[model samples]
Target: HHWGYGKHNGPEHWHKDFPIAKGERQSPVDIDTHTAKYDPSLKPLSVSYDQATSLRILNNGHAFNVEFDDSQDKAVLKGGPLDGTYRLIQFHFHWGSLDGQGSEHTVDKKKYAAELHLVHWNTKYGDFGKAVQQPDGLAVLGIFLKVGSAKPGLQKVVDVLDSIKTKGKSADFTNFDPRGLLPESLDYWTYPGSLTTPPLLECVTWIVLKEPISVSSEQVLKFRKLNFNGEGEPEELMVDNWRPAQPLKNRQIKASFK
Candidate 1:
């Protein structure tokens, strides 16, 4: 496929190879000096898998998006986890402009090397389409991405990126337990919010983790190699691919253990 120039022409041409390039629901926004309506009683809803989730890997070259088959039976979240069956749709990551800081979102005005999000829907309320309309419709598991000495629990994911390192390349990776990536501490902050991207839907109840996972710089470079650089051609390197942080709006961000 013919690719455009890096700065001005690349991304527009990228869609030809991967049609999903036009997706507006991308993530990792910076959390600046944002204000929110606080509620003392608000706490995070706990979520657990009702049945085993199926995983699918899609390689459109730019990055790998792991999709979960939630149509079968949804995950069960109750009490502090949330009260209902939440269908885990998918989970993915975003990097930054620099090697050590690519994530778009921030905590306390701080940026991390990357950001990981596990996206789910409240099946008890409705399907993906219907749940999106209510305040308790969706759940996004947020984990901060940091660079450090130890390999992150995501070794299972990085092992595959190199195998399918081109566009339209993918494979079925089943029985993958995502909980393996969960940090040891279940401590997290909760908030009533919306999807960070457009539709900019306001039904998402966020559970942002307190700690971060560490991955090697080597693993990070592999992610960079997957982009089309907005010029439609394989970028010499990963350009700025993540979106900036969104406003908390009239939302309340409360931590369970804070």
Candidate 2:
């Protein structure tokens, strides 16, 4: 079986099985705003997503992922830290059991209520599988979630969670636009990192937004109700599905804002 967030088989023990888990440029780092250097040369991020391309939502055991159709160029990401156009493949979240410590990446050592990752693959390498093996293959838009009033954009996604509560379960989800989930500011810090999960590929250009989106406490707890185990198995409440921040090592964290 693949790795998960259990006491004996969690992130702390991942490196023992996967060597790259200890590699340089690993993701979910603690970004200290005081150390971030602003780069005026960074271009404004260009994000255009099509609602028609959204296919379905799945409970992939680790987290709930909303998958998208990447066969066409319907949804594309460019500019900012990207060198070319990248196709939107899917988006997911990571959260903890409590309110104060859920997000994978922290700002100034402060954790958010949750975190969102919009994953894309560079078209230069054909598909996501091949692209992830290359240096500039992936671009992930990381958004932090703060506790506040309910987000209308999230209500749509939250409403469907009950239908796909167990692992491997999925439901048809279409005509949903992801643009509504973004905050006003596109200002972000860019760096080279790997996937925060298993296989932990070092092919991502991480664009972590400065501003956080709001979510009600009730809305957050709803996600925790998901079961890590599949139907007919002993239920394991899905919580703390986030990786701890790894060492920054010899990397540069460049900012797009002052």
Candidate 3:
């Protein structure tokens, strides 16, 4: 059975196909800030981006991903629990069908309307696909999204959804700065975890921001209408495209800010 966000092959049933689902270090953990240890040595995050490098946006049958050109050092994320420069490959979001229940990772068991994931690969590993399999080879920046004011940067992304409504569909989307999607504060919690999808590699160093950005209710609803099915196939509204929080066993979550 194909693994997807459905009753038959969703997250709960992933272990049947991908054995690493029951691994020690899993992703989307419930981050308890009250107990997270503050580390004074943690460095402030450093991000550099070239808006021109953004290439296209695609509906990958799972989520809508905004792709970036990583051929050069144009867009990169470093510092803050990372050893070397990590090239920005792409970014995507996870949301729910309803108003207030989407984000993959939670804070103190509190879920947000949605979440954004900026995927990067370590420079030492060379390429994203190769780096994704090794421990400490990938870094994912997680930003939570709450319901409120409309974000103009996000509106740019939303506008292109209609063009890439089905799986495998893509449209030219360039000159977009991914940094505009972040919040003012860079304070975050860091931990080791695996990919929330199939294969579920334990290679990601998660940097979860403490503050949440806002999006208008109507704007968030647009994500709910995306289709998981490709053209000439049955339609399935792509809502609730998020994995529930996993067990945080034998792991220590470190905080960069108090």
Q: What is the per-residue lDDT of model 3 for residues 5-35, given as tens digits with 9 covering 90 to 100?
A: 9999999999999989999999989988787
Per-candidate TM-score against the hidden true structure = 0.75, 0.98, 0.98
How would you encode candidate 1's per-residue C-alpha lDDT over 3-120 as one tens digit per residue? Answer: 4324553444545664534443323333433443234465555657646475778764344678887777655455554766677888877676676566656777787888788888
Highest lDDT: which candidate?
Answer: 2
Counting only residues 3 or more apart in sequence or on different chains, how many pairs clash (N, Cα, C under 3 Å) in candidate 3?
Answer: 0
lDDT of each: 0.64, 0.92, 0.91
For model 1, the run of ten residues with the poorest summed lDDT: 24-33
Ordered by lDDT, highest first, the candidates read: 2, 3, 1
Taking the tens digit of each residue's C-alpha lDDT, what string does model 2 give over 130-189? 999998999999999999988888899988999998999999998889997899899999
Instruction: After the best TM-score superposition of candidate 3, give how far the Cα of residue 22 lies from its true spot, in angstroms.
Output: 0.6
